[PDB]
Amino acid sequence: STGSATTTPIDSLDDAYITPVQIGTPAQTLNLDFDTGSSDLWVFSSETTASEVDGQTIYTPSKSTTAKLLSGATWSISYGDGSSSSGDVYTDTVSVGGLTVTGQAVESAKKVSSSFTEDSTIDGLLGLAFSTLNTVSPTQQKTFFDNAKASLDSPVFTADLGYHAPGTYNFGFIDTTAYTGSITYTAVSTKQGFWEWTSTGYAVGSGTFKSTSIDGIADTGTTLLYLPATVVSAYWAQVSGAKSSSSVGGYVFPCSATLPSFTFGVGSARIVIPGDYIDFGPISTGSSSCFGGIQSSAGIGINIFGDVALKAAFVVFNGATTPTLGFASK
């Protein structure tokens, strides 16, 4: 089997991407944030504290003939941006782009933090990191990908995120029309539960490539590119007037700037992030200070190849017995 679903930016900045997902019988379609940095499939629901729902579409298990309470199971998750959610668990039929999993754990939110409430466009998350990170207790649950894997034509999914445009998540096949040149594969460590890999270096604009190992995660659920302070300083030093602002919470730059590109290494291959991808616009409405899309990972404890990086590539998440990551230009 295979699946193919379009993913769409939630706003004009590509802050996140939503993908329609069918849950239950008859289908209830919710727009979920596919997150390769976490491993819970959770949804706004008929159980979510009413004051914490503001425009989201909810899953109502009582209206699904295939829903079953997973008795005694609870979940609770905290994300890198400090947001969180928690609740109980149903199993139900879940389909993505024509690919169906029966018995998928669907984590129903009883509580969500303010950032989730405030984002009316995101009805929940669909985790695509390794199932060892799943938070369901006392019986840990598998991700949608883990459950689908045996049925897939090939044990893979691909992320093809757009810049200010829709893109695609595919399951079970590699669309050879969706990228240019060849795919370069690189080793993954699953020790922390992430799609963790080592970039071979970077360049700023038309500058020379610096060969240096940068361990980080491929995380579709993080907006920006978070890299070591040395790398990030070297980038912003090439933008007149750019500075790190503690009051704003990172590097800012004059909105009048033309940003240089940023290149990262994948083995001997190179992925180029155009300068425009690094512009996250005014820090507040009407400001002439703009927020940068490359930020320091110092004090996160991990480097994160978030959407800024990933949307510059066609990315293969290879879930074979020895997992690997593939990157191609597009």
Swiss-Prot record:
Protein name: Endothiapepsin
Similarity section: Belongs to the peptidase A1 family.
UniProt enzyme class: hydrolase
Reaction equations catalysed: Hydrolysis of proteins with specificity similar to that of pepsin A, prefers hydrophobic residues at P1 and P1', but does not cleave 14-Ala-|-Leu-15 in the B chain of insulin or Z-Glu-Tyr. Clots milk
Sections of the chain in a coiled coil: none
Positions spanned in the full protein: 90 to 419 of 419
GO biological process: proteolysis
Keywords: Aspartyl protease, Disulfide bond, Hydrolase, Protease, Signal, Zymogen
EC number: 3.4.23.22
GO molecular function: aspartic-type endopeptidase activity
Intrachain S-S bonds: 255-290
Catalytic center residues: 35, 199
Start and end residues of each Peptidase A1 domain: 17-328
